[PDB]
Symmetry: D2
Subunit: 366 residues, 4 copies
């Protein structure tokens, strides 16, 4: 895919020729096992599968990286990365997803030290990375659900001085808007369940990275732990991936419209969105994101959140994000129910007509 | 419902409104909260997955089952529940054992064919006894009822890897074990076209732990995969009984061949644990191994025209491998030990292929 | 598949392991179009598809035939064969309401459809005396009364008159009946039923030997576009692996249910090819290896709609041949000598004692 | 779908709530048969007739044209065959291809097929003067020269004579052209192309308003059995979500490529509805919201087969409308030197460079 620009790589990355038949869309490789005498690279599906490899090739290509590994889910991608951290070693994470905290709790019970910190300030960064035995700095940016953003290039340099690996959970931004490896991180982490697959009909995760020893370690764990995705699942993720830039560009454009509606509403308090000049880290946003994304959160002042949630007729009240269907949730009641107020609302903008979405939001806020 | 009926109707939840006989495939990752309140997100809840789990649980008359992205993932989940400083006694899974050991789990290997058992369970802080029966690839058998009684005296949990036998032939929970472990990739799905794993068990606290781990570690299967595993499961008893019948035919063929030595099969009268086999297996299974005396295993392997030379087992296509060259390439496993996984092809065609390969 | 017996062909027919990767199970070819420069046999999905072709090779192998063609449904397979009959020509048939829908369509385009009794020599002689006879259309056993037609004899007589003979072999499946070996020119299938066997995909098939027929059939399929999807072909092929296991089980259980029906005081006539008193039992012994998994009977115990309501294991619904046992009342359902109280059973692979108990509870004799 | 604008209907058209579980994406109904006793209202009997997944796709498609009815098929050809089955012996079809494959069949069934030039008032009048005229069959823009037919005018005139009008709208898609709003009776699609859009499923569709037509269409589909599978319907529906995003992108890139073509010394005529000099430019502006994603041109540089071999990004193969850009030479595949491009959603600069490199050689 050398010489292919990003949108071209979405369509043709890993689109391996079919010998003999010439299929434009690669056939779906469902076989669990392989005839050894007919080859010698493919032995067993948990280890090797052409449809999976094609998706991995595409994902790697999207960040100009040599390696990628896909998993049964975003959590599995994250768990795989955490397994490489030894008991006694330390993980530093942003203080601002409940999923990753569940994993962090699991890692803690295995003896991993988890430290939460403010990575938006030089003071907070300095203190965090002063942690002894620092092995991994875990950056989510923009964060969920307050959408604070962390200077990946800066934190990476500081972390690399201390010998630590840096991972960026790039799920919110997607590789259309943010390129962590180019920013200096060692790993990009994805829940491909969200915008990468984009149609809310398949679970998946991915890690994208450049280090060969990390690669060997990652594949070893995936093989032994068996958190591999199915071939049909990889097919759906890969198919959704074609339209990723078209979809993200639309969602961002609509998000901007919705933000203006929110800021003009007498019943909305704080509005959290990376594209706002008043965003506490806007300069960083301009430095590392090509566009401010499709996720918005805000404080609803009009009463109980459930009343707001009940009034939407187009937004779906449900969890997850990044898909073609617009979604709304209340973190306190839903994802973060186990600075997040009881009335914080999070929007994931889909690809519906922006005026329909704007009118629905406006009716809801009433 | 009897067993064969549960294969078809287990977890077959009627569709409201439309009345689908085959339940529709639930691919959605998320759910509308206002339209229900049990389903929140696909990694935690999915109707297609739940229907499969209900079926599997029903096959062992158990209250619980949980499916996974693979057999390895089911095993990893079970192993995650063992705490550092605690001990696992056992008869890949060894790859998983290396992982567990490096995190502070004590793994002890023992001979569980002898009353080895007493010595094994004398281990302090014994938390889990991990049994495969019949074993791979020598098809030795472990008395599950006996080991479970002794292990429960010591406060330990017992798991049986029941992949080789399947619930058609062996019922570990009924024998006294706490957990049945499966690679559903093998005979349960049966068509070599989907990966999966399962745990079947009865303890409610275990259920909570297993699901909590699965949701957090995210080693869940996709809905389309669950559909394929469930679809294959309909014919599990038909397939297994055919495979057993043919295996018996192949065993007679092997016993008559001059280039065959030891033959390993739970169904042989001379089998060292035959009494245990008759006691806990309703039939002796579709896996056969034997020592090839004609030379290097590749000389034999290259001559098959119907058996496929490849790993895995239990599916409709007959498979042959040499553990020393293949699965066990990284215990009584000779360089020329051959393992057969019998499929549902015509038994005369398979017998003829085996004989031709052996003769040259 | 030379040297492969029937059960082996079910598993390995049309299964050529993948070059390079060596997949045991062939990958699913979903692509609609093909790069011309990378090959030159594959141009467009409506015409060519490797997954579909593998299924066709398998079906063909089951009857030792050179050709097979699969379709979007059994109806489409039937429609295709009927398309080859010209206005003014005649079709003689024994039949399925579907096939009657199609026969009505063909008639409105000028095809002459003559229905006959093909179980007696006079009826056979009378039918085949039709001028411009192009096609003799045999369903055996028939739906839902399960009468049977001597395929060999009718084929002999029809070929004397220069006509093509097709046998709808859906009820029997190639496990139990081989129309081409009996002398017919075409086997017609709704693969939706026992061939796919799991009630989760629609499909049709034609199996035959004439190369000119092959050309005409494929030309129509491409032009009419009644082709199945690749994923559907995958599900049919996957189901086909267990066809003989499934059919043998369904047949064994059907025999048990037939005995239960014969013992019931609220059952009158029982229709089953396996019964000694069956009007064509001798033909049955001659052309079917076992009498099949379909049974019909006259219920004497009260309203049919109530009988249907009392089943708790059998599903009340149309279609047949799948792993799930099905029950219907033709007068109320598919056909809405067929009495108002005729019941049809399609036996699945559930435990025979469970099915027998469900039937007895429903009959409430 | 009342109150939903077009792009919203793409996502939410036919997205039927799942009772109990609340699935956002409806589950895939693969079952061929249904328990009759499990239904409050008996609507589902057998898959060849009824299927919820198929119906959801139909509801969506119908919604995209604000039409009461839609019916989907195993392929575009099956959709066409179905419509042609409704033309009775002695009646006449007037038409502007596989459709010509179908027309031959109709001829052998006693249908009179007349071809006419529908771009002129003289040509239209002559065409519509046919006795027993039952059906006017319009493709616009046409394949492969992209000429355009005035749907409103032909429909007005054809309805004067009591005939039905169908427009094959596959090239334009409902994003760009709305035949029913223009006065036609039926919109015909190969959903295989841009509607599904990912070149991985076959399908056809008819969209229309007349209830008697609906009954006849469904009757034929059930009897002929040219129904699509539920999994295929799922893939078509899934592709449909991004239809407007894809088409708008393809059109933008098509415009860029037309400029590259107009600048090439080895290109003659360039055929594209968007060109000011286009012989039917007034009609294009009147009935298409954008000029589409198909371009054809006369290649002057040598044998076409050599040119086809030089593409490294465009795929040489038939079909169109998908995310992958395609190129073919009609004379060789589907003047001797005419090339047809189907523009996908790759980066426009990558596509322009590939085209320029191919045209240039070396």
């Amino acid at each position: 895919m050398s010489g292919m620009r990003f949108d071209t790589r979405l369509v043709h990355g890993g689109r391996r020729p079919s010998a003999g038949t010439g299929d434009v869309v690669p056939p779906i490789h469902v076989s669990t096992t392989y005839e050894r005498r007919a080859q010698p690279r493919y032995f067993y599906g948990r280890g090797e599968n052409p449809t999976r490899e094609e998706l991995e090739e595409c994902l790697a290509g999207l960040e100009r990286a040599p390696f990628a590994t896909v998993f049964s889910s975003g959590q599995a991608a994250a768990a795989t990365l955490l397994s490489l951290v030894r008991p006694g070693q330390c993980v530093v994470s942003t203080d601002d997803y409940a999923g990753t905290d569940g994993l962090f709790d699991l890692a803690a019970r295995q003896g991993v030290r988890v430290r939460y910190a403010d990575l938006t300030t030089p003071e907070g960064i300095a203190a965090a990375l002063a942690e002894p035995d620092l092995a991994l700095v875990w950056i989510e940016t923009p964060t969920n659900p307050l959408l604070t953003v962390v200077d990946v290039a800066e934190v990476s340099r500081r972390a690399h001085e201390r010998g630590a690996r840096v991972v960026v959970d790039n799920t919110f931004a997607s590789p259309v808007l943010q390129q962590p490896l180019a920013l200096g991180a060692d790993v990009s982490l994805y829940s491909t369940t969200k915008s990468i697959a984009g149609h809310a009909d398949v679970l998946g995760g991915a890690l994208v990275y450049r280090d060969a020893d990390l690669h060997a370690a990652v594949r070893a764990y995936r093989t032994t732990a068996g958190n591999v995705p199915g071939a049909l699942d990889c097919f759906l993720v890969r198919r959704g991936l074609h339209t990723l830039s078209l979809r993200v560009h639309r969602q961002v454009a609509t998000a901007r419209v919705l933000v203006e509606r929110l800021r003009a509403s007498p019943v909305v308090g704080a509005v959290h969105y990376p594209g706002l000049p008043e965003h506490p880290q806007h300069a960083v946003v301009k430095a590392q994101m090509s566009a401010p994304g499709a996720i918005v959160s805000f404080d609803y002042l009009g009463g109980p959140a459930e009343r707001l949630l009940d009034r939407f007729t187009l937004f779906t009240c449900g969890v997850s994000l990044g898909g073609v269907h617009s979604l709304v949730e209340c973190p306190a009641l839903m994802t973060h129910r186990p600075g997040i107020g009881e009335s914080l609302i999070r929007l994931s903008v889909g690809i519906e007509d922006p005026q329909d979405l704007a009118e629905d939001l406006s009716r809801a806020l009433a």
